Amino acid sequence: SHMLGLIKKNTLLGIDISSTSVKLLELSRSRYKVEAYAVEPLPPNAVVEKNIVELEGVGQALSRVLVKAKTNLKSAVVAVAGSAVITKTIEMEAGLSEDELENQLKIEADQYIPYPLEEVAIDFEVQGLSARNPERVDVLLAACRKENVEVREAALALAGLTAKVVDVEAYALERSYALLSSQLGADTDQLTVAVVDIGATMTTLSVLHNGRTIYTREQLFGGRQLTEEIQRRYGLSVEEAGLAKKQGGLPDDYDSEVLRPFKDAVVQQVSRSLQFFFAAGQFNDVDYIVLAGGTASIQDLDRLIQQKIGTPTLVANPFADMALNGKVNAGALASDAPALMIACGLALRSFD
Amino acid sequence: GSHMLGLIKKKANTLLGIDISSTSVKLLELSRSGGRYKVEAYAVEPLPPNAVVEKNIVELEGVGQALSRVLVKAKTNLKSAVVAVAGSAVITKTIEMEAGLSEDELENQLKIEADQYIPYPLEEVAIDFEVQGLSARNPERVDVLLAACRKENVEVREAALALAGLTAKVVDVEAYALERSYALLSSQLGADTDQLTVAVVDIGATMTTLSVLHNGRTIYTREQLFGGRQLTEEIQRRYGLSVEEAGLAKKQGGLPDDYDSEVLRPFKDAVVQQVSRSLQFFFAAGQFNDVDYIVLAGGTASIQDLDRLIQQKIGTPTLVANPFADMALNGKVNAGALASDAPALMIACGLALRSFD
Numbered sequence A: 001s002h003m004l005g006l007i008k009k010n011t012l013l014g015i016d017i018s019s020t021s022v023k024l025l026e027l028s029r030s031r032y033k034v035e036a037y038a039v040e041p042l043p044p045n046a047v048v049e050k051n052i053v054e055l056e057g058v059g060q061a062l063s064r065v066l067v068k069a070k071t072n073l074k075s076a077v078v079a080v081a082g083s084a085v086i087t088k089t090i091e092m093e094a095g096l097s098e099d100e101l102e103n104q105l106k107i108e109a110d111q112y113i114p115y116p117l118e119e120v121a122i123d124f125e126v127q128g129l130s131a132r133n134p135e136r137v138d139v140l141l142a143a144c145r146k147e148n149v150e151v152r153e154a155a156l157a158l159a160g161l162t163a164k165v166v167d168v169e170a171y172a173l174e175r176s177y178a179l180l181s182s183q184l185g186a187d188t189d190q191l192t193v194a195v196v197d198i199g200a201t202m203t204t205l206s207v208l209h210n211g212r213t214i215y216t217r218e219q220l221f222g223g224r225q226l227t228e229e230i231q232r233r234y235g236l237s238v239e240e241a242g243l244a245k246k247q248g249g250l251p252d253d254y255d256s257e258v259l260r261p262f263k264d265a266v267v268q269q270v271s272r273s274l275q276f277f278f279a280a281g282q283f284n285d286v287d288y289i290v291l292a293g294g295t296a297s298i299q300d301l302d303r304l305i306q307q308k309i310g311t312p313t314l315v316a317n318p319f320a321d322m323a324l325n326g327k328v329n330a331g332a333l334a335s336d337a338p339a340l341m342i343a344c345g346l347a348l349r350s351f352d
Numbered sequence B: 001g002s003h004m005l006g007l008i009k010k011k012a013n014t015l016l017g018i019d020i021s022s023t024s025v026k027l028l029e030l031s032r033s034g035g036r037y038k039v040e041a042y043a044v045e046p047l048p049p050n051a052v053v054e055k056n057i058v059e060l061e062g063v064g065q066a067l068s069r070v071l072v073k074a075k076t077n078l079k080s081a082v083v084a085v086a087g088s089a090v091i092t093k094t095i096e097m098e099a100g101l102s103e104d105e106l107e108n109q110l111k112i113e114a115d116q117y118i119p120y121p122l123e124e125v126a127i128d129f130e131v132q133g134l135s136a137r138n139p140e141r142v143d144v145l146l147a148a149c150r151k152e153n154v155e156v157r158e159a160a161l162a163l164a165g166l167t168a169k170v171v172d173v174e175a176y177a178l179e180r181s182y183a184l185l186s187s188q189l190g191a192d193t194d195q196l197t198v199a200v201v202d203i204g205a206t207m208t209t210l211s212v213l214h215n216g217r218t219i220y221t222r223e224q225l226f227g228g229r230q231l232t233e234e235i236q237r238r239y240g241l242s243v244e245e246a247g248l249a250k251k252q253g254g255l256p257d258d259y260d261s262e263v264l265r266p267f268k269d270a271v272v273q274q275v276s277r278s279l280q281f282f283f284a285a286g287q288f289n290d291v292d293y294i295v296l297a298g299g300t301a302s303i304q305d306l307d308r309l310i311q312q313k314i315g316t317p318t319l320v321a322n323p324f325a326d327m328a329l330n331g332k333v334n335a336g337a338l339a340s341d342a343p344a345l346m347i348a349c350g351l352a353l354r355s356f357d
């Protein structure tokens, strides 16, 4: 049987399918090491909200991120939104094997989960015997619609990839966030930290106390508001405008007429997100603010946010202590670091 | 399977590192938070004599209780553990098999055809394998790495763990565990473990093991019936002490003055002579003509200023193994006792380090 470990000699790809891009990350373990990484832009309306709509379009883009990454791995960990997952702890009969529970859960899930039985993808974990009654066990349940799973399974299939693990995004963030312990000066158990993930069309506040998420809020603020003022003012395309953010080269009036106002729009948004959280719970302050997402790469945006809020702020970098494959561009990776938090957390799932 | 789902927050649970040897049983529990490790629990429970002869468990009930007793001394709630068999118990061989066969299909055939590729009889073999890839000689066949041992070596350790309420999730090999713990010595060695070529000398009670480690991998292994019991036996005889008495005075001291010149010094030289021959055996065997470092392991490596002697007499930089140098410690863990037992826990640590690789 599989008690044997006579041979010392598995890693999975971290694939984050977003609305504007597909991100791939490969990790190894000894100390961690980045074997490969790539980001491939998506066609518009290919992924609306957190749902894949144009099936074949995502597949092609998924196929293109593989060649750009240039890897031989073919299994991957993908993530669904936490909004699609229902988590609850129920009581079931004791003395049942995991196979028996799984079967009964295929039969009787509709009673515990709001989704219609046909459409339920359920996951469970026996916590242990109920303290009250030795006849019953406490069973943790996490379920989502099979639609969320199958569409990602099919989308990965178009690139010859297989979904080894269907993870949840909030959990993957926690895993990669734990790698930030070095940069904060204490292990994350000590701290309550507000992670601000500033994407292209969405900004997310995630408060993590001792490593576990207590708060999540989302707003329609993002980096696309920055691009579209670049497109508009300078007559550049979506592709051209995006590079000008990284590469620069925009005329002198860029800072004062476009970038500085957007920074203020970021600061005001981060400020508003934090105020929503304070008035919604027991917490009166946060220890740190961690900027994540592509828009977090804006020069000295961390310093400005630190000023206007008064809370310690840093740009997320899960690859700070990691080693790098020679074929991985160290400069490119550093600039895309705060956008790879989710992709990093999915890749960290491989070692469990 | 149908569960391709990772919707529930995995525990990512660790395992106990249990090193069952001929004279003692050692336990170690590890965790990690940042880049720094932490010793959650550890205890050592001595074994009855003739309970484990050579690398074989002989008294099943006797081993289990000492195993069960260590748990309590360590005071841990973990019930799953990693145990290790000796590399001398493992046959390693690379064979060619039909291509296009699944992992499941190959294992089924390997259970029947085990006898053909392995020295052991069909009924008494525990076989492990890994597909490497297409064979170079013939692209129609695949290379499969085999590692196998006698089923008895595994089963008695599983049953012995069961009697203490423990489960052997992983049956490891002692040499691999040594490699994992040896990596932690990067700080003390003044160089990365990936670069250096190091001869690790594990001086036990009844067994001495030489392991040459180049870039992290084992290339050489030689064993001798030389050990620290030779020192303990001389203490028993000359001063009328018991095995327990002799062992305690070995560490704590307080014996009469003639002990150094007539007992301790001759044994020290006997240690140096032993290490000398092993390295000479190794240089006159393989391609290597010299090594960068010598790492002393086993409780006998705790002998005061023994490290300098071996270092001076051989002419190679030498260090006493301590895998808990950079590690953090649980409050319930004796920081002083661990230090004195540090070099003896190389194998037990590597068994616990199995979870973090």
Ligand SMILES: Nc1ncnc2c1ncn2[C@@H]1O[C@H](COP(=O)(O)OP(=O)(O)NP(=O)(O)O)[C@@H](O)[C@H]1O
Binding pocket: A018, A019, A020, A021, A198, A199, A200, A201, A202, A222, A223, A224, A226, A227, A242, A245, A246, A293, A294, A295, A296, A297, A298, A299, A335, A339
């Ligand atoms: N160096 C940079 N400076 C400023 N902005 C950048 C930089 N690099 C990337 N961006 C912006 O970062 C955004 C992409 O962030 P990313 O986190 O990948 O979004 P997303 O989470 O994939 N999409 P969504 O969450 O659906 O809105 C793009 O709009 C870019 O404009």
Ligand SMILES: Nc1ncnc2c1ncn2[C@@H]1O[C@H](COP(=O)(O)OP(=O)(O)NP(=O)(O)O)[C@@H](O)[C@H]1O
Binding pocket: B021, B022, B023, B024, B203, B204, B205, B206, B207, B208, B227, B228, B229, B232, B247, B250, B251, B252, B298, B299, B300, B301, B302, B303, B304, B344
């Ligand atoms: N302070 C000390 N100084 C010198 N020797 C010591 C000291 N403390 C313990 N020892 C001895 O170091 C020896 C090493 O023990 P250890 O290597 O754990 O035994 P073992 O390897 O389990 N048995 P074997 O399989 O025969 O090697 C023990 O026999 C102790 O007698």
Ligand SMILES: [Mg+2]
Binding pocket: A018, A197, A198, A199, A293
């Ligand atoms: Mg995002």
Ligand SMILES: [Mg+2]
Binding pocket: B021, B202, B204, B207, B347
């Ligand atoms: Mg030993």
